[PDB]
Amino acid sequence: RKLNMSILINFLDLLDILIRSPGSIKREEKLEDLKLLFVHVHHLINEYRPHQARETLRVMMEVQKRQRLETAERFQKH
Amino acid sequence: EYIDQGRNPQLYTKECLERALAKNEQVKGKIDTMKKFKSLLIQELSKVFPEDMAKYRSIR
Amino acid sequence: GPFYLMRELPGSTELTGSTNLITHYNLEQAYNKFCDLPGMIDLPGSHDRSLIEKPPILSSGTMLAGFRLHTGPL
Predict the structure, then answer these.
(1) How far apart are CA A30 and CA A32, in angstroms?
(2) In chain C, N or C: fewer CB atoms in 10 Å?
(3) Of B31, B38, B56, which is closest to A9 when you measure between CB atoms?
(4) Half-sphere exposure in the Cβ direction for B24 (13 Å, CA)
(5) Where does the protein end up (chain A)?
(6) Contact present, B59 and A9 (Cβ < 8 Å)
(7) Cα–Cα distances in Å, from B52 out to A14, A33, A41, C25?
(8) How far is A2 from chain B (nearest CA, A)?
């Protein structure tokens, strides 16, 4: 939530820092800075996937028990 | 090569002045278009986060 | 509170391309004047190897000489 405002404000600050100083070197560090920010969002977002991956595992264990009971009861009925 | 044809340099200076003025006018046009685009995008999305716009206006 | 990696924007109006560069560079009156010299040259003389002179310019004993060469009057 904090990173989003910063990249956006920088985008807006990079828009007018060109006019405030065209020949200044800091514009390419801002792009790089922008690139660094891009490296960060993807890096931070990827944090969720391992936890997400773990959740997928539980249903497989869970669904079979939901399936095995049905087979046993059906067999008993037959 | 301008002297080779034979002509006073006043016309050449006039042409240089008019082409530099044309370049200045198109630069002014692109500057004012990006400025008004910035202004319209700022005022268009003033409601997304009032505190962010307040801080932006304060810092300027 | 503060956003990440805020910094100071440059001096409010330094030298840009949004100024009138000519009027700042004191060249206004020449333009306001300006906006053939062969003809200008022509007024002084008659009209205005002209093929040869250009080639010579592309790359880039007065008393004794007179005595040496004599030209028949008729």
Answers:
(1) 5
(2) C
(3) B56
(4) 13
(5) Nucleus
(6) no
(7) 17, 20, 20, 40
(8) 11
